[PDB]
Amino acid sequence: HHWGYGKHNGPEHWHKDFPIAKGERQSPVDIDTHTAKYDPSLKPLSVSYDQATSLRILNNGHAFNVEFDDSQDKAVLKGGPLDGTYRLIQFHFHWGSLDGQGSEHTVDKKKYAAELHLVHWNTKYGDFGKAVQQPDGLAVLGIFLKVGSAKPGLQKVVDVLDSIKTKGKSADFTNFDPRGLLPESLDYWTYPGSLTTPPLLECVTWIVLKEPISVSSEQVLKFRKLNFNGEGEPEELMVDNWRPAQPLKNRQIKASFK
Ligand SMILES: Cc1cn([C@H]2C[C@H](n3cc(CNc4ccc(S(N)(=O)=O)cc4)nn3)[C@@H](CO)O2)c(=O)[nH]c1=O
């Protein structure tokens, strides 16, 4: 697989290797705020990250992943639209070359500067690889980033990026607290969708928070210094690693808030 975000290997090409790219529950989507309906059946959302154990940060040539120890129920997502317990395995971001683009989800066609994805798998399927084969295998908590005041809880991530500049580089990343990346409100939209990168599996319950976090221009400029390429290859800045909005088809976006 040589998929990426360029003219020759970007989102408009992914369907050739991954025909599910044109499927019935692809992500991301535009969230039409006027059409999304409050759902009183939604239970309270439970983000329980007190025991989260971060291990490492990896540049995988598409984004960087902050990886967690998911060998036990430590950092879990429950409630809201979810049945059962979903374990945090990694988080990553998508971002732009410019502050006016970068998010995958859009809100009334507005693009944010970036989007954070906290990826969790359903513990009833035993491991992540089994979970991605199930329609309810994953829950991704999506958080928008706008440029304004710095996010203090993000700075430890920003400061390690110079040690993982190129594809395949990793660094120790223990004792990182993902609670520092959350906005005040847990108001959210939810809909059934997919991974937003190949293999684009239709296994995700999306939970997208309404309240963005603010990060500084300096923080996002450091994301844009990363490289898609490996060490000793021509430099290709890691920017615009977002898939655009996909057709909603036969789906309803539900709101947690009246
Ligand atoms: C802790 C750990 C991780 N790994 C593997 C599997 C991990 N993985 C695979 C994928 C599938 N791809 C994906 C995910 C989200 C989105 S999005 N943009 O949110 O819709 C798109 C694509 N997601 N995470 C991966 C990262 O940690 O490393 C283990 O094998 N053992 C381990 O112990």
Ligand SMILES: [Zn+2]
């Ligand atoms: Zn993502």
